[model samples]
Target: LELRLKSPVGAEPAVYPWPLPVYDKHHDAAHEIIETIRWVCEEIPDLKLAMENLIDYDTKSFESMQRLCDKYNRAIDSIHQLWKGTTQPMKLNTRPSTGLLRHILQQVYNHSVTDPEKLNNYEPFSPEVYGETSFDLVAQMIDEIKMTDDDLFVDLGSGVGQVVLQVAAATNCKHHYGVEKADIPAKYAETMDREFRKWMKWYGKKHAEYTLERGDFLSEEWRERIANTSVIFVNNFAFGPEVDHQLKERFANMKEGGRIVSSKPFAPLNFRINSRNLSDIGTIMRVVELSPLKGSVSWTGKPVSYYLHTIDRTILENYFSSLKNP
Candidate 1:
């Protein structure tokens, strides 16, 4: 049997032999090979003019596969040539294309997910229930938010650390972190940590520093970390009141100008700062409903709205001044 790897841009599909002549049972070498070819072509237009093609391919024998590998290896040598020359900065100047990031995420998931079926075993409406934000939504969020080298990024309830990994590779933030409290995903995070590093090295790509650890976001460490974080990504779509309430408490401590993006709004869009609602998060936060991510794809199979919250206690301070003047 053969597998055909289709390009998202509708380019000709690349064919490869089936059963993936991978040395290990857990991770496949094909992912690294494909990513190297994809990334290099994007960086060097000369190669792209001749290339533009892979998961889904077919093949004949071991000799055929070895020859193909040798051919690509020579192409890689050309990449090595640039490192010592003027293009030494080639690796530093270019950001991974969105398409490249998406493909890398797939490769990460493949290596991280030990048991595909077991990863989705969550009880509905439970606090530990799992859901992933679509990549389109994440990419949009990254495009909207600007992170500086002094900025710290955190993903609450990060599943398999995909969002964290994506942001790390795409942005220049000082560091990115994914904190997961669940048993299964946290376990897989260890493998993800290794695979992400390995694959990026294999492709000769650069990414911002990132850490994926198993911890409750509500824990003391995260409580303090969240306050210092400049950019926060939360997927609180399925969380209940208690957890959401606790999350709000944590957000209250975040520094001014700190921004948060979530599947659900933590504060009302039209917040009134009257005495009755003074205790609400809406009083200190300016919440704006984000447009629905067009063509967002997720396991939920439903359209989900998102919200952007900026920590602007000035709203409350101004309200107090108004009351005092009146």
Candidate 2:
């Protein structure tokens, strides 16, 4: 029984035992415990200097495997013991950097998804089942589509709510919603809810409000929700034209300036409004193609482009004004 310790920097994951030892609360495994040491040490200069000899960064692994478990618990207890006199509240907040965010997410998945093989029990490239977006891609989206506190964010077809959880942690949006249509991913969504909360607490971080729901995005209820949302994220790369067209119809209802981040462009990048094509979604929205950061990995194992579309009807109104003025 071997556990592959995932690498946040896209380095080859370190290897360990699967039937691994647990942390103080029996919630974290050996890999999680070891990785926590690295994170905490990095967070504090004092801890890093003292704990440097304890870790083996050369291989990105622990130096001693056998006693690492007990040693960690003792060290944490010592950490608590040293903070006895609290003259002032020491401050800490995660920057949500790519590596740190990926590490936290991996820990959440390791806890929530016990039998990952079960997730593979599905047809290939169907709307009901889509692949996970890599952390690198997700990180880029956070920067690409900056969110404000007034925004309501939703992830269409949120497989196990990974993206929702990631965004919730990284942003201060009003609330995040993950709507899943399939049973398999929805079933695990429950586990992700508990694990997401638990692991975030374990790391002493606070995430934005989020929910994972089991429902179709095309339904009547979601139609209104999607229309009202400020930011929409959908992995519609493999979705058929029928579904994509329905989505565009709903996009027509979104408020001006509402944005969509997607793996495929919802409308032509070179959309032009004319007499016949006035009804086209392209007339009301603008889509831009983007190249993902280098070293980004997707489930397809290929680096494809992503798109960002913003609803701006003024573009069309301006066209009418141009003709009238001319």
Candidate 3:
């Protein structure tokens, strides 16, 4: 029983959704699939017209549209074949449809999926079965971090504690912590940690320990304590400027050798990530690396692998700053 339950606060580093099976792979199957889809669109001018203007649509949404309109009914049917209530993939080498495919579908369907709650179902990746991240995705993230004994693994908004747990299960770390803010989700994370404990015992591997805290990481006191941690990973989606402000404050106090790995970067203070207001919320995430340096902070603004939703960093920064000053 290596678990400690704290206040019923929301955790930072929210749970990561499962990874879509889209990979950069080369195969004739992809072309054949696309060709079949294109032919379907060509026959249905309404679908084609929509596709021509589908740039604004999301990957999952567009893909759904493509299947609904395709002639062979093979494109979507193929995806249906794999959705057998299991997270495991039927084929390893096969490439899943990416955003590009979805872009086309959005036009064909002409049914833009603007609702967040409604969009949750269309996702090929989810947190229920695979914790916060899939094994393959977590493995890649671990390799990217290049484990060290001094490293303290912290996941902000860690849903189900699976990502942090997996890291602890495989590596030797000083400490592991997950910050979550939701009620039922916080408990779900704890349940996942139990599974992690069982795994640690079975493998006989050097297990890194962890704790899950439910609260807002942006709060000042939390930031002070968070500064002490070595590596901090934010697994949350965009809520709004508050999230951005919280991130800025935390970064302001970040210690040497500390790192901030988020699903997205902190933008200006305007971006809102809350579900309360539909107008201010529903932003996308910008996955970025922010670090403190002597002269200038180090920012490895590379592209992120996962595409969960939209987020803005610059708007987030200013939003929080205004609240603090005013």
Candidate 4:
């Protein structure tokens, strides 16, 4: 049994061993405990995979680390109970939606983003173009939106598709969609979706059937689809005036009372000249700014701000009237 438990040659890098205690007397005992835990995880592939996310290097919070360890400890206890003939079968660990998706995304992409210069057409990307929404912010968005199982959720500029998967899992929404323009990021999003589907099978729940489109989010087909969606999440940090204008036009057709969650408020009007004539064309989104919460950090370590809006014509009119008078 001891020989079987030992890792094969050249497997050291993959394994993350528990830290040894400072006291010399306690070292052997700690190793024994760690070895037992490792063996238990090795025996159950699903448990092992879930535990891996807990110890993943990218995880930053100590509280999260504790929760992950607690989950593993509980699973280990259940296994012992089953072995002692007290329990009929061992129950597997229940993986949290955000933690699982976050870990999986980091694993797939190594928390790296593609260089904007490489994409000839996608120039002028925001300095923090590769920013990802943290799990807490995603939860806040879910709570603020108050999504129902009947509602469809769509994410524009979805990075690695983490927000889509997290929202789907937590809300059990029937339809979730993500539109990503970058090539490599879109591919990662698709891979994450595939893995999420497999996770759903293991988890024994159905719903959150998502589709990932690897193309411009402003395409006609997606615009049409947006009309039916009840909630939309946009990381508008990277969007410029041109793209913003196109988004507003497309959003004009969205269902009334639909929610728009974005990093910046999509104001109702903007000054522009068309056909050599100045005009106040409709931007179509009404802002009811939700209170600011500390959101995900950018590459420069600054907190990102988020806003919410509802697709109400009256609100848009009121906004325009204020703008005109002021």
Candidate 5:
């Protein structure tokens, strides 16, 4: 069996993880590997007969089936790593690459420390699939806010630590933190954190200081990190009504003048919730339009609205006051 590998776009030494099946330019390397394996079985009559017999055999032992499943998962994980290796280079540059980041992060979710199957067991309201924030939007928001080394940036529910790494490296922020509740993604974030450090070194610069916390953002420990945050990115698109209400209450603790970007408008301004109005949450945050950025919705490519808010009571007060009298 001959193994042929194609390195990432810019890398030297073209090495591949698996043998190529045939000369096909349309499909990716992963698909090629699968097809190659299929053809290999067909080429060898003995191997093909063995595979057919294995497929025809019925196993009553749960243990045997479990081992087969484990092997299957491992094979998939191996294929994923090779595929990721090809695209990982695309993630780092002067600009953020959302497509590559999403692919890497999704693989992270699949090959996390936790069993990928177990990741589906969400407790109560914890959703498994959270949409990634738009890389373009994040860049625009960072520039609009003029983030520098002095600012503290935080991304709640930071998937695969993309926003944090992007902001940390791009702005060279002194401190950055990403809080993810999901175990699988959190592990993936930790991996990315290490990769970012290497990337910084590769660029002949020190890695920006950052923290990847593997826990609920609303937890007491994580919330403590929020106190001094200058900029916060809340990808609350997947947040349910209960989570939203609790987040609003907790968000009031943000330091005055801090900026908060959210997929859905925060309370008082968000009329979707009938349970509580703006007055109940008090004048904690105000909306601010920093730029005319047109970023697509997270996960899906569909366009949606996002809002910028500042941690100032007056901004909310003055706007609502005008509404009452206007």
Candidate 6:
């Protein structure tokens, strides 16, 4: 239940979104982009504050933000739909293409407002349970993940609604739940949930109801909440061995056939899983297989991974469900 709050910084500078130009000594372009990017990062924390706020499910204040969220969500979707090849062009500059303005634009685009980012500074950990799980890879994994109507798919540290969303989309399950404790990512989840409802209104396929909660897994309430989940997903990004210990204590007593899929290796927790690899950017993504160890939630445990997850239809569906119930 411990929430971290950031103190407000000073106001952003003018022309906040531009990237500083890196130009020759006589020419100012080189230094211009660099200075611009710094100014953007420094001055635009407010914009980030505005963009990262939790979506208000029932409020008029968020109307403008809601529209922007809808637009961004749609933009990502449009890109996904259009990206047929392995390589795609991301807009490098959406700013005014000047100094501070360019930086501000990049910050807005990449501030990373989710657990996948919050837990691990927004870097995708190598293939393992706690690292970033790509929508494409998750889609592939869903077919491999065994499930039944009685099974509940639970994504621990469900950042920006990735794993939970995929579970709802890929399988016929009883329930899909994503547990995330961060404010911004949780807010994104809420917005995603709204968007998903709008999408399902026309599709007629009853997607699984997803719930999102803002809290640590060590809480007893979480333990009780996940009692019937058929499959549990874990990634190292959120916690260390200590958190895993708490999970194992509860998981050990569950039905023997119940399964856990983890991204990081925690031998004490007894996760008998294997590593998975993903293909992208000329590198093979490796997913770590967690080995369970016997212990409890300890006060000391360092974070071990970064968090990042792109959006998709399945993700939006689960997010929508979470907003309705959580």
* Per-candidate TM-score against the hidden true structure: 0.82, 0.84, 0.43, 0.60, 0.58, 0.44
lDDT by residue (tens digit), candidate 6, 1-326: 11111111211212212232222334232233233323432434433334444333321223433443343344334433444556453323121222332232223223223223343444343322234554434543454556778787788777666567556755668788887765566666665555444323322223566776667666778777665656777765446556666765656444434556665433322222222311111011123332222232222463222222211223234444665783
Candidate 2 achieves a global lDDT of: 0.76
Which candidate leads the pack in TM-score? 2
Q: Which parts of model 1 have CA positions greater than 4 angstroms off?
A: 1-18, 21-36, 49-64, 78-94, 297-302
User: Per-residue lDDT of 1-326 in model 4, one digit per residue for the tens?
Assistant: 01112221111212223332222332232333344345446445645765575454223343443444466656555554555785443334333445444443333232222332232334355522666666778877877789777788999888678788778767767788888887767866766776566534433334456787777777777878888888999888777787777877777788778888887667643423233322222334456555546554555676666777777666455555776784
- Encode model 1's per-residue lDDT on 1-326: one tens digit a residue: 55443332223444556556553464465655556466657766645544543223334354554555555555445545654587643434345788877877777777677676777887777888787777888888888887889889999999789899899999999999999998888888888888887666544477999999888899987789999998899989788889999999999998889999998899878777898888899888888877767775455786677889999999989998998895
Worst lDDT 10-window in candidate 5: 5-14
Higher-lDDT candidate of 1 and 6? 1
lDDT tens digits by residue: candidate 5, 1-326: 22332222222222233332222244343443333334333333433444443332123344443443334334434433654676332233443233433333332333232333443445644555556666677767766778777788888888678788667656767888888877667866776776555433332233467898887877787566777788888888668777877777677777887888888777445432222554555356666444545554434566665678877766565666677784
If ranked by TM-score, best first, what sequence of candidates would result?
2, 1, 4, 5, 6, 3
Evaluate all candidate structures by whole-model CA lDDT and list the values in order.
Answer: 0.76, 0.76, 0.46, 0.59, 0.57, 0.45
Q: Which scores greater on TM-score, model 5 or model 6?
A: 5
The local lDDT score (0 to 100) that residue 114 gets in candidate 6 is 23
Q: Which ranking of candidates, highest lDDT first? A: 2, 1, 4, 5, 3, 6
Clashes of 5: 3
What value does the lDDT take at residue 150 in candidate 1? Answer: 83
Candidate 2 deviant stretches above 4 angstroms: 1-18, 21-29, 53-66, 86-97, 295-302
Give lDDT: candidate 3, residue 82. Answer: 44
Off by over 4 Å in 4: 1-128, 199-207, 268-285, 294-303, 316-326
